[PDB]
RNA sequence: AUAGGAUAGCGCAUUCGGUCGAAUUCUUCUCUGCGGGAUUCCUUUGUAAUUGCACAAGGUGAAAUUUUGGGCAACAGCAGGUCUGUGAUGCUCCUCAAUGUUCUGGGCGACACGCGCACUACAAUGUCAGUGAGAACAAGAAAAACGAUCGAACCUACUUGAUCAAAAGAGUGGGGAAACCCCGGAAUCACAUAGACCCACUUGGGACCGAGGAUUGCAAUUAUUGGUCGCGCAACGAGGAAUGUCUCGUAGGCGCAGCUCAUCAAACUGUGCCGAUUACGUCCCU
């Protein structure tokens, strides 16, 4: 199974809250943005965060997302 | 049509024909000429201690000499220890697990001695055995005969 | 070999008081007599000038006598000493090759020799136990 | 200049089909040169149905400790088997093999304690036919003067004709007869 | 002990040499078979496979039968067409 | 003697040990026949899937739902 | 003449730091450099039973030790080579100097 | 004076690595470890290697001399590595010295027959673990 | 070809790691310290949602779901094992004809028998005798001694023995190990080898035992271990009730190295080689 743990989901929600303007619907550009705005050892975790960050952006286009606060 | 040259290609060298066909043809040539030295011990001994029975081919020494000559052609500078690996087998140990044994270096040393007397093999510089100019000529000329389907 | 079966073919060949099977190949029919193995039988055929691809039932009476005399005294036919099953007899010191009933007779003498001197190997044989440290 | 493959450069796959309406998508008639490939067939559930049928027959000969992993040996045995099949029937041995596989396994079985009659899925019919034909030939040739390529050819030819002389057909009838009782 | 029965069989008697009667059948009856194999000929002529295979090689050398499938351990023959 | 049926829906693994699959199969018959577009529920032994084909032999018994 | 420097250590980071430092110092001398060759890494393996008494499931511990080796060839006199490799090397790194022929 | 047209490719299967040197020559000449194609045994493995030619057609190998050196692995994995190198060598030669419409019809023909003709199989031997006699087989358990 | 099939070729024809010939250019293959690369990322008139978290097929791709295989692995416990690992230890016992410590010999191997785990087989998908092509992980020599800063221990190639078996025994050289072994000729395997055997406890099987000889060691008898010829007429022709392990480079088969090691692997720890059947489920048994 592929379930995003609370470590990935919390980081992804923080990324969108602070870098919403710089994010996109494409995983590969979002991954590049996330690489220099986050500090972590795991390349796998950053890739997982980029995957869920793109998922949130697609959800945000359709409507509001609970847990995300865009001021 | 079966033996015609493919096209624009002529002649033949070793490694271009069947390995068994060359060895069988070379063994026949050695026996027909009657100049090769055949030790009397080859009539009673086994090719290696890893075997359980003596060779069933009466011309096994000629075949072994022919196969050794081909081996020297492919690996110049090879010794009896190197040839021993090529002619090894899995020895049956009864109720114990079986193991690989290198062939006895005795018959191989004899085979290189016989080929040296014929002038086909000379001791290589800095150890080993190598083919002479005549030995290289003999191998490639016979390979052409195999390709031509002469077979002596 | 496509050779027709001769009228003198024998299915059982008598040789050194052993019933040698005639349907077998010559070297593999000679290994039926005691003291003759596969390696020894091939040498016997070589020294007797008998083709190894023949069937033992086609052997002539003179062929069998030549076979029988080679088995009895292999050394006379240029068979080396290291090829024989009794190279230096502990009682006589002579190299020979036991065959037929003499293989069992000498084995009984070997067992009796070790039992008379009460050697450990002889004692194990009398008690019917293993003697090679098993 | 490219040409369609022929098994052992001798047997053509042109027009190869199974008369059974079922098993049509489970018997692969893809042209191949030899019954040897290194594909990763057992990776998805139904991928083995796409494996060429002769290779499946070759895999059925790699049984017991002395036969495990000898795929080149199985390919050589099949080459002689197909020639014997051609002489026995005067037809394309590839078609005879397909016919034998088409009808070599029961269409109805009994399972489960009271046994109950059930239908057999097309994947299992192809699996069972290959398994039963190879098992019968292997046991027929065990302590026998006849070599396996003769035993395998006889088993396949008889199964292709539906004759009871084949091990696979005999087992199929007994299973189906018992299934009829357990209806 | 003795957990199995074995299912003993009858030991066949196969000639290791040809006689005139069997040789004639090999040169006359055999070249009419559609499928020819050393195992098959051994069964019909009650002869060993070794001498049956040797007899088939003589027939093939005489152009009385043709070699269909050949390997080191397996030989398959068939009758000559017409 | 054997009618060909086509699996159109897999209902699940029935019985103990899950070695039997219950499916709904539509009988493939020519138009105008009494068995045209007749769907029946059967028990299948072996790996099966949707759009698979079965040789039904008899087509009167209907498997109990589970 | 050709001088070969062999760098061997247990720590990969230390062996890379020393090798790069030697390369930088040699580049400042404008001497001919034969690029640092990374020789195959050798692993020492010892596998022992975990228990000290032979009781329970026969579980094993696999201990591994990795050795890293680098070589650099210098076209410089021994006097120049000696003062190239005259810095505070990292602990646990062995640098050997040999003259090729 | 003519320019030398030459490419080099590799094929891999288990631990067997085959390197193929494809050179434009006077005549087609494909050899594996110095052995011509028709001298490779068994015939089953010869047919597998010949698939790299028959699948696309021998007209595309018309003036190419291919020398394949195969090391590692065994009898079968070397044959699969050799045929992958030959098939990949033809693609590389047409990529370097021909246009893209060709080498694309060839590439689709190769992949329509077998993906492994051009793409290496990733499968490798699984390590043995202690308490096991192989990758998976556990020691025999007895209960009394 | 002795009978000789099937299987790529149709500006310059191929071959020779001893031809230990030179030269020039280069990094496709090998080596590797940090990097890159995969994530449910893309697509469904899929499932589901009727928020979501997700799932199933396919696509992309070297790799498609914990990528694969390991290592690590909480909190509570068991009177589980170890006082035979230690100069880890409380209490207790012996302590000069000693339960300390050496030395000699014997034993730990002893067999009516029962059990666990292996090895070898019962043969033709075979055994012999030939011949071919061909892995990977790894190992290698010494003192504050002894001899004249090295050289000898260790592993090996080649040669010699050889004007006649094997196993040996010698000589010379190399290697501190990507340098020598080594272009690591492993065994399953392959052979149109025109080879022998032909269904039999048989040329299957190789237990048991006899005689010669060599080698390790201070010492081989209770065979230390190889090799030769005998013995094979030992059981065994597929194994009752029961029962172990296992889902892909997997099972099974096949050898190799390391480890114990002066000498001795049917063991273990690793390694590569040949390579499947079945399932893609269920809670019936545990
Ligand atoms: K708990
Ligand atoms: K349960
Ligand atoms: Mg054996
Ligand atoms: Mg074994
Ligand atoms: Mg109990
Ligand atoms: Mg605890
Ligand atoms: Mg306790
Ligand atoms: Mg205490
Ligand atoms: Mg202690
Ligand atoms: Mg105390
Ligand atoms: Mg005392
Ligand atoms: Mg003990
Ligand atoms: Mg017990
Ligand atoms: Mg075999
Ligand atoms: Mg038997
Ligand atoms: Mg259990
Ligand atoms: Mg132990
Ligand atoms: Na165990
Ligand atoms: Na643990
Ligand atoms: Na012996």
From TrEMBL, chain C:
The keyword Cytoplasm is annotated on this UniProt entry: yes
Domain of life where this protein originates: Eukaryota
GO terms, molecular function: RNA binding; structural constituent of ribosome
Keyword Cytoplasm: yes
Keywords: Cytoplasm, Ribonucleoprotein, Ribosomal protein
Subcellular compartments: Cytoplasm
Gene Ontology annotations for the cellular component aspect, listed alphabetically: cytoplasm; cytosol; nuclear lumen; small ribosomal subunit
Similarity section: Belongs to the universal ribosomal protein uS13 family.
Protein name: Ribosomal protein S18
Species of origin: Leishmania major
Full-sequence range covered: 67 to 200 of 218
UniProtKB/TrEMBL annotation, chain E:
Residues of the full protein shown: 25 to 106 of 120
Listed name of the protein: 40S ribosomal protein S25
MF terms in GO: structural constituent of ribosome
Family to which the UniProt record says this protein belongs: Belongs to the eukaryotic ribosomal protein eS25 family.
Gene Ontology CC entries for this record: cytosolic small ribosomal subunit
Keywords in alphabetical order: Ribonucleoprotein, Ribosomal protein
From TrEMBL, chain F:
Keywords carried by this UniProt record: Ribonucleoprotein, Ribosomal protein
GO cellular component, one term: cytoplasm
Gene Ontology molecular-function annotations: structural constituent of ribosome
Top-level taxon of origin: Eukaryota
Record-level GO BP terms: maturation of SSU-rRNA; ribosomal small subunit assembly; translation
Family, similarity comment: Belongs to the eukaryotic ribosomal protein eS28 family.
This protein's name: Putative 40S ribosomal protein S33
Species the sequence originates in: Leishmania major
Residue window of the full protein shown: 21 to 86 of 87
Automatic annotation (TrEMBL), chain H:
Key word Ribosomal protein present: yes
InterPro entries: Ribosomal_Su5_D2-typ_SF, Ribosomal_uS9, Ribosomal_uS9_CS, Ribsml_uS5_D2-typ_fold_subgr
An MF annotation (GO) of this entry: RNA binding
Domain of life (superkingdom): Eukaryota
Keyword Cell inner membrane among record annotations: no
Keywords: Ribonucleoprotein, Ribosomal protein
Any single GO BP term: translation
GO cellular component, one term: nucleolus
Gene3D superfamilies, sorted: 3.30.230.10
Pfam families on file: Ribosomal_S9
Assigned protein family: Belongs to the universal ribosomal protein uS9 family.
Name of this chain's protein: Ribosomal protein S16
